[PDB]
């Protein structure tokens, strides 16, 4: 028989053993149909690293085990594709001479030499080595194709109309995360996805992506939109979705009411605070916000409006007109305060304050007339208002609802800036009236705009 037998394979760098000898080395003796597994006492397995850093596998038969005549002994074990082969088939490594049959990546050689050593003879036996002449090959599994999808959403979610500018495409990059120290490859594969107005979903795929790595995606920052990237597949079979969701915008509008001067400008402050109770800073369209404060100056030329474009989602707003800008107006607000989770319009209404005019007519000497005014809430007026008698602006003061004025024939006094929706009555004092018949135009009335009352004194 032959003895001192041993079988040797040097694996090429394109394959490798499995963890924990899951590789299951065994030698099977095959003879007359029947298959039998050599025991620990008949064969031993050694893995070693050669000087060139290749893995060598040896099945050493128990030295005095003699091969039974005509029996086929077969070493068997599993290998798996190494990273080298997974990269090679993905196209990421070039083959050198000697790597694969005719440099075909589908026919990588598994071995860098294999042989059997054996002795024969009693006494000083003789030793031969025969190299195996078969040089087998294999194809690694196909590399991955990794889909990527882009979804655009309007402010209020999926398939809602988008109003913001979009670029005409986005460059997406697949990042192969480095495992063995080193840096991530951020340009591993790239694709340009089309972007068309009102096409909300669009797909491409990275081709020829090597298995063995974790992947991530890079997608550009697009102004006016927030960005979410998710792997909707798995670690080993990645598939990515990028969602761009438009950010909300706050429109500040001014409305003039009962105001025939359209050439005034108004200053409107907006206070903007973050969900994390914090200083909001930055520029949103034309408006810069410094430490939560922003100021919008409105006029006819800017269509009585300003827009803070594309504020953080959830931003808290409180709009208020500057004190100076409110003089001469009853100022009311719609949507003054809120949280910005969709587009919002906040409206400042400046309603010009009403005046009262009183006129003395004489038919058929100063005349004293008492004005009584109660405010909208029906409490008597206290305060001083500008009053005009032929271009002479004198202050007129109301105490507890009453003021009193002195008119000559054909004089008008005009009292400005009175409170909106208050009620006046006028009455001549009975001493002024002595001798004359007094009647009134518009003696009582509601200050919902500029009003006129007339006192006519007829002699007799």
């Amino acid at each position: 028989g032959i003895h001192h037998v041993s079988i040797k394979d040097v694996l090429s760098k394109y394959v490798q053993l499995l963890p924990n000898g899951s590789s299951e080395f065994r030698v099977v003796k095959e003879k007359d149909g029947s298959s039998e597994i050599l025991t620990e006492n008949q064969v031993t397995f050694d893995t070693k690293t050669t000087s060139e850093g290749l893995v060598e596998v040896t099945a050493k038969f128990s030295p005095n085990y003699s091969l039974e005549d005509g029996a086929r002994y077969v070493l068997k074990f599993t290998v798996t594709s190494s990273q080298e082969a997974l990269d090679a088939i993905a196209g990421d490594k070039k083959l050198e001479a000697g790597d694969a049959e005719g440099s075909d990546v589908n026919k990588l050689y598994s071995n860098k030499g294999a042989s059997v050593t054996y002795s024969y003879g009693i006494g000083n036996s003789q030793t031969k080595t025969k190299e195996y002449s078969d040089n087998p090959t294999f194809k690694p599994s196909d590399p991955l194709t990794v889909p990527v999808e882009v979804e655009w959403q309007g402010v209020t979610g999926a398939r809602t109309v988008i109003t913001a500018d979009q670029p005409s495409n986005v460059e997406l990059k697949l990042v192969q995360k480095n495992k063995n120290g080193g840096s991530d490859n951020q340009d591993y594969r790239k694709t340009n996805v089309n972007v068309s107005k009102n096409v909300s979903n669009e797909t491409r795929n990275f081709e020829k992506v090597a298995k063995g790595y974790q992947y991530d995606l890079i997608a550009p920052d697009v102004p006016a939109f927030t960005k979410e990237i998710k792997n909707v597949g798995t670690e080993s079979n990645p598939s990515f979705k990028v969602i761009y969701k438009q950010l909300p915008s706050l429109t500040i509008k001014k409305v003039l009411e009962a105001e025939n001067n359209l050439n005034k400008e108004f200053r409107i402050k907006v206070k903007l605070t973050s969900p994390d109770s914090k200083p909001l800073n930055g520029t949103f369209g034309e408006i810069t916000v410094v430490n939560g404060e922003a100021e919008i100056r409105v006029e006819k030329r800017k269509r009585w409006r300003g827009i803070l474009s594309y504020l953080p989602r959830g931003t808290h707003y409180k709009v208020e007109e500057e004190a100076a800008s409110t003089n001469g107006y009853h100022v009311t607000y719609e949507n003054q305060e809120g949280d910005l989770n969709k587009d919002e319009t906040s409206t400042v209404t400046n309603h010009k304050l009403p005046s009262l005019s009183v006129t003395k007519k004489v038919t058929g000497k100063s005349f004293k007339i008492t004005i009584n005014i109660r405010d909208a809430q029906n409490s008597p007026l206290n305060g001083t208002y500008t009053a005009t008698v032929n271009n002479k602006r004198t202050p007129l003061q109301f105490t507890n609802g009453r003021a009193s004025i002195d008119l000559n024939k054909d004089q008008t006094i005009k009292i400005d800036g009175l409170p909106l929706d208050s009620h006046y009555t006028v009455e001549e004092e009975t001493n002024s009236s002595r001798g004359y018949q007094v009647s009134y135009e518009n003696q009582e009335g509601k200050l919902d705009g500029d009003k006129s009352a007339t006192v006519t004194n007829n002699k007799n």
Binding site: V74, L75, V79, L86, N111, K130
Partner: peptide, 30 residues
């Protein structure tokens, strides 16, 4: 010396990605 024959093959392992069975044999004959 007896005659020896030697055969080495690799086989894809059915239904598994990237696994292959190596088979190195020896037969001795008188």
């Amino acid at each position: 010396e007896p005659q020896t024959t030697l055969h080495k093959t690799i086989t894809p392992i059915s239904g598994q990605d990237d696994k292959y069975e190596l088979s190195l044999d020896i037969t001795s004959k008188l």
